[PDB]
Amino acid sequence: PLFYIVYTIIPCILISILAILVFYLPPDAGEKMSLSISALLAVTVFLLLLADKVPETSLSVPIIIRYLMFIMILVAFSVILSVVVLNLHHRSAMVADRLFLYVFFVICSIGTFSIFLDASHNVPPDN
Amino acid sequence: PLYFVVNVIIPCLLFSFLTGLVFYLPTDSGEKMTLSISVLLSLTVFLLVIVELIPSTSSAVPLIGKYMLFTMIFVISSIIITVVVINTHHRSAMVIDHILLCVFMLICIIGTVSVFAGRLIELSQEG
Amino acid sequence: PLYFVVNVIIPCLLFSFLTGLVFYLPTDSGEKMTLSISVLLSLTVFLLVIVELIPSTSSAVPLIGKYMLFTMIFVISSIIITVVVINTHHRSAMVIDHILLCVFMLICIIGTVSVFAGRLIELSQEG
Amino acid sequence: PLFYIINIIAPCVLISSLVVLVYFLPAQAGGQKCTLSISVLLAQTIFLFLIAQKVPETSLNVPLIGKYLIFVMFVSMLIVMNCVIVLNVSLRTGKVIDKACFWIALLLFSIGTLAIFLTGHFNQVPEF
Amino acid sequence: PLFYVINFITPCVLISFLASLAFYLPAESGEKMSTAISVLLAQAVFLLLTSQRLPETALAVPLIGKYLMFIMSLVTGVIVNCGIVLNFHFRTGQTIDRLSMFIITPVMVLGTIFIFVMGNFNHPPAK
């Protein structure tokens, strides 16, 4: 029923570009730091409204959270990384390179895990 | 129906980080105060909309008024601390610890008190 | 049912202040252009949502299309002036008066014309 | 009644903090603070515009009586107008920042006072 | 029903000015990249809310994916270009006019190639 899944995936994929770029935006342009914050606000209003949209949709027909329980975590960590990037930034190149690697590595894996969840869900629920 | 008590506690907990980070984000990096300003707007729209979501819910599903006062109080103190923490910020190595110390100490207490009010109300609830 | 014609005129009147102030905020203080930029976003979300509120209202309550064109035109000119007034800004003691003079003169007219269109339509309405 | 009043009053007490803050912060605001405050105007202005939206729908949903309504529109408008003036002030822009804090306070505590008195007076006759 | 296209076309057309102006913005105003950042947030909240109106509409109205991808892809591209401009933005000058000439060449081409899409669809019907 892939209508919504494709848009949701695109929100997270571009949003990863926001944090990747946010993260990635520190290596490439350090002064953006506070500018990066603006992204946190923005990236944070965007996700909070999505939870609401998805808050009403859930109302219409209840079922597995899988993805949500999946989408919820990913949001949270992007969320908690943004906050850490913020703290990492607030506290505030080796760490960034480190925090770029850790981010990427984390998000590739969480996204890999989350994508797996999505992959695993479609085989399980399919049966 | 604990689906809202999770997300609400999560808004507060992360929002504490905004302030804590707002508070903690001054001492570590004061230069981002305006950038800070942006967080106040952001932190303030997010809360103002949460009062919304919750209004429709409460009015939709009736419940006891006393548990609602706590949300308001707590929310209004983060809100008042911000104002002061912003005045603080505006006015703002010793003072932030100072403000951070008096914030933390107040929020841990208030939060401790509020958590007790749930706790104690939890004590009664359990029986 | 004049409950909407009040709030709409108020949004325009204050918004004129944004552009007047945006225009007038350059000449008096050009240094806040980006800060200005922020107003364009802000001034632009506010208007874009008003077109929303009004869409549902109009479609909900039917009315004559001709009175709708004026809102669009006017709104699109503030919008076009902003774009130019931004480029004007971007591009941007003589020029602002210049741009402010040509803005004012255009908005007073356009606004004068639009107010006449209501006026004249008011003339017909009165009879 | 009104539980919302508590909530509405709360928006317009904290929001005075903002403008008072914005105003107050002007005198206690850094060089970059004039633009910062700009940020508050936008923020303070999105907040009020959405409160208008909820209030609107609320009145249609429940019964209608504008007296108190005018009070909200007028105070909101003036905070609004003061904000633009503060901006204009800060744009025109210390002498007048100081007074602007004084003028604001004085006007808010007078508009507020007036508004509160209207409430008091509104509250009194309905009770009598 | 050319009434939805009206406003949606206008959103896109002005938004191309944003990116065009952003893209152009990069060259004429290289020193306001926070300011452009602000536009990305703004430009990005605007589009995200539009997707929400379109989504609800579909569901409410008949849905047939064909013209969906066209609005979804352009948005994504403007979106990706925006992100890229940031990448570019951050990187930002020998290339600029070419980015400029490449951006307008490309946007023209897809605009043209999208035009065709609807245009290619039109003719068959007509024949």
UniProtKB/Swiss-Prot annotation, chains B, C:
It comes from the Eukaryota. It is found in: Postsynaptic cell membrane; Cell membrane. The chain crosses the membrane at residues 1-25, 33-51, 67-86, 99-117. Belongs to the ligand-gated ion channel (TC 1.A.9) family. Acetylcholine receptor (TC 1.A.9.1) subfamily. Alpha-1/CHRNA1 sub-subfamily. Pentamer of two alpha chains, and one each of the beta, delta, and gamma chains. Upon acetylcholine binding, the AChR responds by an extensive change in conformation that affects all subunits and leads to opening of an ion-conducting channel across the plasma membrane. This is Acetylcholine receptor subunit alpha. The gene is CHRNA1. The chain holds residues 235 to 461 of 461 of the full protein.
